[PDB]
DNA sequence: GCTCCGATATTACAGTTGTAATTTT
DNA sequence: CAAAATTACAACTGTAATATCGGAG
């Protein structure tokens, strides 16, 4: 009946989730422990959650439950994105870019390859 | 240690409170139940924690509250920005920028505005 | 005086999230 | 010191209800 959301720190577990493309618990854990400094009782639990959430499933292999994605990478970022610009932005896409650009926060390199993106 | 947020309902009373620079209490749900439906005890208690938390602060106008920002629009979306994309995207902004250009479809109109962004 | 009102403050209560520990299998 | 499920638990959020204070009468 109701719709879940990922939350921050899930977005984690999903990242490396679609990376990995089908991991164990342990999988994940061993790889986001490379990057960000979380318990295991931690990523567990966020997998759990996702998991109750039914962004992701699960397979037994061999005693240890693998776990993938169910919803699309590029489906969701995008559907998030476009939430987080229009709570944040009265301006919608355009004014987030100006807000980047203003900032300095684009090196020419980088406005070049958009330009690209853009010249499609 | 502490630093706070702005929460996504909040972020409806801040950008009212950053268009009208100086507003009561009242112009704001006035604003806001013209688009969104909320309740004034609902927009009031944003309006409070956004003061508690140091987003915005007020003197008194003829015995009446006048609220204004503290944080600068500009400075703080980026911040926000900068969080959510690096949380969500792996490949940072340009990941973004893409895929928005691969899942929206807009005009040469807004494709040229853009570029008229970039340009500068 | 105290009386009623609108502005402001205090309080409520569940669902989500961060951050895990304890229990079961 | 397993893996998985159960439980913990405060802070932060959405979403208000109720209580009270300072003036217009
Ligand atoms: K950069």
Avoid: C, H
């Amino acid at each position: 009946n109701k719709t879940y959301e990922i939350s921050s720190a899930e977005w984690e577990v999903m990242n490396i989730i679609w990376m990995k493309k089908y991991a164990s618990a342990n999988n994940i854990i061993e790889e986001i422990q490379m990057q960000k400094d979380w318990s295991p009782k931690t990523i567990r639990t966020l997998i759990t959650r996702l998991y109750k959430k039914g962004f992701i499933d699960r397979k037994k292999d061999n005693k240890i439950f693998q776990y993938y994605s169910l919803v699309e990478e590029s489906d969701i970022k995008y559907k998030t994105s476009k939430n987080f610009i229009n709570k944040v932005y009265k301006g919608g896409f355009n004014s987030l870019v100006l807000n980047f650009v203003e900032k300095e926060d684009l090196s020419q390199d980088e406005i070049e390859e958009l330009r690209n993106i853009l010249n499609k």
